[PDB]
Structure 1
Amino acid sequence: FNLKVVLVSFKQCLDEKEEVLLDPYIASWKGLVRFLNSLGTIFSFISKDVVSKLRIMERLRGGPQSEHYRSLQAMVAHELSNRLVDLERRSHHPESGCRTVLRLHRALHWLQLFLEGLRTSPEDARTSALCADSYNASLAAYHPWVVRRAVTVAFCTLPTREVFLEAMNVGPPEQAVQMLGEALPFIQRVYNVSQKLYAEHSLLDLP
């Protein structure tokens, strides 16, 4: 089990017609949780939010309407038609299938930015400031200043640029960086598809 294993499991999230299958997506996320946890990081507390959300999508896929949660496209279609999404404010659907995936989608965005910033960096780069750039380019818009100003402090508990690279269990840093340019574009496709879908239906601002 390593980071390459995870990043190429996303290959399975996109069917032959470019739909995003739920079951692999969840499975791929159970791995990302697993990898987050393997780091001796303060940021393992957010893995309870992920697992929480992953269990949301697991009950929907397991419920009486399993078939509509086969894919994100199916899910969006079903939930928008049946009016099961709080488009305006949270009211009766605070745990919509749509908005839940939206949070993991945004999280998926910070990941590829950081992994890229990890890949295309000087070998003496501050990982705290790598993260801050990635964070401010993704999640920061959706977080209150209190969360913003504090999560920055916690970016300092982060290991070094090397320390991240061997943590992936692929070998020396220079061979982590090589696999990073090869295992990445699987998650980038899933993101891009999911991004397009959520944007076709004006769903990038679900509360």
Structure 2
Amino acid sequence: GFNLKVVLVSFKQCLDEKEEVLLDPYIASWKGLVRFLNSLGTIFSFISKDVVSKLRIMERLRGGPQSEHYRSLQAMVAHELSNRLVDLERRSHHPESGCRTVLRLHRALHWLQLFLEGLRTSPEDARTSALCADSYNASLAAYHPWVVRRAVTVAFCTLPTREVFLEAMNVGPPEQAVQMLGEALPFIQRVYNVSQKLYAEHSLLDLP
């Protein structure tokens, strides 16, 4: 019943007719990713908590007195910039602003998209560990302190084989998994592109 396709396709729900990035569905989709990650039984389950803690921050903003301004990422950015609830230069009175919090998930989404795309078009003899590192170095690595970068990089060598990873998506044999990624990744890509435009245009790509 539960599989990676269900999660990827849930990202369709994150964009409305005006391509507002809706926060509730975004959270729901990320909870799907966490459940998938935890199902893989790798050492990276050690880091699921960081995602979960970030989702809870966002859920608490959605449960608060300004909940309506957190309905979409676009609304969130407008509200937090106009009320100075985002630390722009250095961490200060708003260490857990919606803007800086969502940024971390967004960067991770970028990594995930690069990793899954890499996997989708990889040769049969490609190593999962290499797909992960190359995509990590492309993306998330620059935002992590050296101690984290080095530990993550080493941990990559302990990942399952390409075949096992594809089968773990639970959508059939590797060949079916590969076609699934092609049909489903565009949903996560669209969410990423719209979110990246939002952050880029507001010069928020480097929030502390």
Bin for the TM-score computed over the shorter chain = over 0.9
Q: TM-score, normalised by structure 2?
A: 0.98
2:78 is paired with a residue of what secondary structure? helix
SS at structure 2 position matched to 1:114: helix
1:184 shift after superposition: 0.4
Is 1:162 aligned with 2:163? yes
Per-residue deviation at 1:66? 0.6
Misfit runs of 4+, over 6 Å = none
Residue by residue over 1:87-139, the C-alpha shift from the partner in whole angstroms, topping out at 9 and shown as x without a partner, is: 01111100000000000000000001000110110111111111110000001
- The percent identity for this pair of structures is 100
Structure 1 segments unaligned to the other structure (5+ residues): none
CA drift of 1:145 comes to 2.0
For 2:25, the equivalent position in structure 1 comes to 24
Residue by residue over 1:143-163, the C-alpha shift from the partner in whole angstroms, topping out at 9 and shown as x without a partner, is: 122222221110011000001
Which ranges of structure 2 fall in alignment gaps of 5 or more residues? none
The RMSD of aligned alpha carbons is 0.6
Q: Give me the whole-angstrom Cα distance separating, in 2, the residues matched to 1:146 and 1:67.
A: 39
| Counterpart residue number, 2:52 | 51
Secondary structure at the aligned position of 2:123 is classed as coil
Q: Distance in 2 between matches of 1:155 and 1:202?
A: 32
**Deviation digits for residues 66-94 of structure 1, max 9, x if unmatched?**
10000000000000000000001111100
SS of the residue corresponding to residue 90 of structure 1 reads coil
Kindly tell me the number of residue pairs found equivalent between the two proteins.
207
> CA–CA distance in 2 between the matches of 1:148 and 1:105?
18
Q: TM-score, normalised by structure 1?
A: 0.99
Residue equivalent to 2:5: 4
